[model samples]
Target: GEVASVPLTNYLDSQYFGKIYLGTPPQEFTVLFDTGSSDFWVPSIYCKSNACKNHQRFDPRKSSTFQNLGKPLSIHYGTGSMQGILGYDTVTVSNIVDIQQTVGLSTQEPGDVFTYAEFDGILGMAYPSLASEYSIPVFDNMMNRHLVAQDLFSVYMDRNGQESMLTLGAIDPSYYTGSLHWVPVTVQQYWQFTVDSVTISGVVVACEGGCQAILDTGTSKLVGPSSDILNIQQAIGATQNQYGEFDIDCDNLSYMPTVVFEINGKMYPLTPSAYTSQDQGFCTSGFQSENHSQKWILGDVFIREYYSVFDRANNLVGLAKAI
Candidate 1:
């Protein structure tokens, strides 16, 4: 069969605060799996961020299968920046999803401001069509090779009580014990949807705000306009710290804050922090300080709490309980 599925085994944990290794040598850094965009990129050894200065950069010259494309490329995110040259390589894994085919890679060079120590690169799980023409996401190749189940999987990022999970190959039956609330996705290049209101403890925080929430896995945190963010902060009684940032007491953290939307004349409550970061141990005790207002991005912290399905056939994304 041309279509088959394989489990994404082995939790490759490159320390977020310590050293990382590509082949063996201690490479100071961490890694991330971004589902929003389709590309696997890392900071080059020549990168110049304080975080990059201490971290190890992947050198194409060392890999036996590395090939430089001689083209310049750049990508920007809500929280960081990246730029590099496109290349191809054979990424080997012991017994899991391994791409024996031509896979796209990036070689970062000196003077790039996006490379950092918190995480070196992102493993994008979105469709291959979304990737650059010179590249194809690792997951897309795996799916094409029948290394993963029929282009179907879900990611659960829990920012509060539990850790995150990447369920490759198949969706575990245990994650769907709750009622499924389906939303009609707007067919566009990006997975965007209209949000009528966001409530916390029965208070409407985003009622009057014209905010369009984008389901982005490539991002690592939640983002929105200044007005909407301010509303969310005020509704939760967050301590006003700065113009673009705020704080809330850890004790006040609750999953009950409902994100209400109407469908079929009924309201569906979105999982709390379903698209934001919940792992408080990684950093300070409060939310990260916001620095922008034009775009509010939702990161892994919010995505990992529910079993999400991306239906490319219909250009729609579905969400179900991972509880």
Candidate 2:
């Protein structure tokens, strides 16, 4: 009666995805449960793009419960873009099911970023305000149809993990240690919150006065203003690569400064090992500099260290330390 806990697979800490079922007999696909946006989409037979070639594509003809809406759509993401037609189908996550939910049947996936992705689609978990026009988020549909026990969901991302979970409908206290600190959503869109400041070594470094930041599961890196993130790079002795990513010293992780964020009067600190991703022989720092925007996106790199509860029922984001 509480939750539908779906197991998650960590992809080198760059991506976390799980299985979701759609249509009548339920065609299986691996999807990213993104807290950054509000739309559920999958590659479809309508798309012949090379990116979708290796991924599983949904075929409406196979699902008797699927209905074509004939309307088109274009979805935006950090590294990729998807354009498609809308359809109504049964979407199932764990034991929870939405019988008539709007689903995107992708016709065009233009970015190479998604070509090598391990997942097939995205399932947005943000508020309805961030949803595309003429479409409702899957969680919204669940709310409208009374498919959940509560209007909330919890995500536990294990930093060094063999396992994690995306629990829909209710939160599991067993995944967290200390009490959750509830921070009110600063904006109604994108699961946003007010960030007090960012500090390292007892000094204010970024988000000096105050700023708005979002807890985004769709983005893989911790994103901030260009200059500010560069300052963070400097503090940690990271160098900018030709690819624009900040390269980390795998040997110095033990001595790298802990980056802390003061939010809602609470201090949340991330150790060097928590903010860096080690893949094969290369280690990459999880930082993205945005020259065009001041808003920060605290993505997987941050979430991995904290168990997060997105409480739409109370309009708050709950943070707790994951043991």
Candidate 3:
């Protein structure tokens, strides 16, 4: 079992995608390596949606080893849902290949969100418990076949650069600085863990009593309760605009205080530049307010600053400052 690293392409600072090959003789397709969900799905030729028309699709008829399970598959996300049929084929990530990998071929994917997606589909890395019915999950099959030395993978996202990397089987020491801090997973459903607190300028702003957090690579921004985010915005001297996005003065970015997140007794700090985005001379806060549950999400905004390791065998996550 050897390590495999794949370079990822960032799209508009919103999503990250990497190349993956499917079926025999391998048809190449770019896909999102999402950890928030547990279904490996790609659009099928049967999909008549506008979103599928512009993207590369999987045609079962073209693959010699493709097997149709005749089972219905459906998945719901924060943005949309996809319905399709279950199939089995070979899935290759980097240089590692898993035979008879359970895959979803979407035939009805209709959503405005998909219209803007740069990738063709999602390759989920979450636990098998969250996978769709009758799905084996690609990563699970990899582990069962001993394709990886360890049941772990690491992700390194570049904030100011074009290239990123997802290393399977082991962590690449060159991607980060300092020791990796390991945090226990509170839930296996998602990469759910606990955050001690969130502080600004030495003052606790949110999660004073601790809070659940999901390190979601599928998400682009940090999301928390509306009031908590508003409090953070006020502390940073940022004002809400017509679009409800907190706008800050780019000139004052250098002087802005650091926001720190305490996890497993370790303090992870995010500077103004790391938690803010600049576009058209306007600076927007990377912290988004969610009206849903109280679960805080540490998305790419935090991951870009930290090299992350998802260890499925031990049910823990390792974090370290990115170089």
lDDT, model 2 = 0.88
Q: What overall lDDT goes with each candidate model?
A: 0.50, 0.88, 0.89
lDDT of candidate 2 over 1-323, digit per residue (tens): 33578898977787889999999999999998899888889999989888889799999999999999988889876578889999999988888888888899999998787788889989988888988877899888777777788988999998767769998888888988889999999888899999999999889999999989999988888999988998899998789888877889797888899999999999999898888877777678887789854899999989888899998789999999987
Name the weakest run of 10 consecutive residues (lDDT summed) in model 2: 1-10
TM-score of each: 0.69, 0.96, 0.97
Could you give candidate 1's per-residue lDDT for residues 1-323 as a string of tens digits? 12222222112221111122332222223445555677666666545556455555676566665666656656655455566666655554323434343333334333433433355565565666667667766656666676654455555544333444555555555655576555555534456666555555555665345445666765545566656666655544555545434444444557335455333234545543442223443211122325555434445444544566655445566676556
- State residue 259's C-alpha deviation in candidate 1, in Å: 5.3
lDDT of 3 at 64: 91
- State, as a TM-score between 0 and 1, how close model 2 is to the true structure: 0.96
Better of 1 and 3 by lDDT: 3
Model 1 CA lDDT for position 203: 59
For every candidate, C-alpha RMSD to the true structure in Å: 5.8, 1.3, 1.3
Worst 10 residues of 1 by lDDT: 9-18
